[PDB]
Design an enzyme around this catalytic site. Sequence first.
Site, mmCIF file in Angstrom:
data_model
loop_
_atom_site.group_PDB
_atom_site.id
_atom_site.type_symbol
_atom_site.label_atom_id
_atom_site.label_comp_id
_atom_site.label_asym_id
_atom_site.label_seq_id
_atom_site.Cartn_x
_atom_site.Cartn_y
_atom_site.Cartn_z
ATOM 1 C CE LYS A 130 -7.932 -0.502 4.392
ATOM 2 N NZ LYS A 130 -7.167 0.663 4.914
ATOM 3 C CB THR A 162 -2.617 4.137 7.603
ATOM 4 O OG1 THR A 162 -2.912 3.741 6.257
ATOM 5 C CG2 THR A 162 -1.380 3.372 8.051
ATOM 6 C CD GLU A 177 -8.579 5.034 4.285
ATOM 7 O OE1 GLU A 177 -9.574 4.357 3.948
ATOM 8 O OE2 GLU A 177 -7.433 4.551 4.392
#
Lengths: 203, 136
Positions: free
Chosen positions: A127, A67, A38
């Site tokens: 998440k 993010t 990621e």
Amino acid sequence: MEELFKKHKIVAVLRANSVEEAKEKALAVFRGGVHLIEITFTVPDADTVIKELSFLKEKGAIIGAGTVTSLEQCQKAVESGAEFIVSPHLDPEISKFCKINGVFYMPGVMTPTELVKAMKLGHTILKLFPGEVVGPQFVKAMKGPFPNVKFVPTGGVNDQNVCEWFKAGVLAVGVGSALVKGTPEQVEMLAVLFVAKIAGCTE
Amino acid sequence: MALAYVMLGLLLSLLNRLSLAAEAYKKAIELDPNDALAWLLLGSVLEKLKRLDEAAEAYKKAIELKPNDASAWKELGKVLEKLGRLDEAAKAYAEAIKLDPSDAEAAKELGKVLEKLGQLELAERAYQLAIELDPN
């Protein structure tokens, strides 16, 4: 994408200060055995990092974006070649944005209300950020009223409590500095030790 | 015939005639160059005879034939540690753990090699891994 989360069970939340730094750490993570990488958008030119790692997809790697705070960030991620979009918060425009583009999206959830908001958008995989605070008992408390929900905790996940998370019934786990911080040798060694540790947790 | 000289080299190793056993494993390799069992057994005998770099060469030849033998990568890490190549031994022990995450010996030996190399962070993680595997 859910088939790969259940397969490799670990995601590398990669933060860096340069494209050269993020590319080196991603290579060491993949050589260590972690296939789900990621690439966070806090890295300068994170879209350039994801596109310049397109050769790792031939080896069998899964490069994604992390993010992701804005819609404008989401295009640069998808257009660069990201295979899954990750955000520490729940955004309704981004969820519908990846919905129509055809890219898997994992929003950041901490409250049962926010999980319901994300379920109404179609998300069954969430998440759990920050898992440092809510803990594995949060995942256990949601298995009752929300049995169709799977979690991927991030933040506060180390080799000490990785068995605690998988005992609660999490799908995969995201590791940050406890895997990515260090030299290419230390990062590759940290990935192997986490892969073997999770292999001992899911036995 | 290749397995016959391997079985001869085995029996010679039961009676501790190691140098003669290595010559028997050598003849079995001359017969079948791809006898991965003969290469692995030869490296174990040469390791006992302290023909170290010759044993690591035999271990590498066997691993080329059996890419996924955890004990072969582990025994290669033993020879590379005894040879002083701590970086090569750590990479070999890591491959053995990637193949068999339940190898408590490979995890403890990796912690010893990493501690000797200076990686106190990585060695402590490998030691805790060996403690969780072996409850003793």
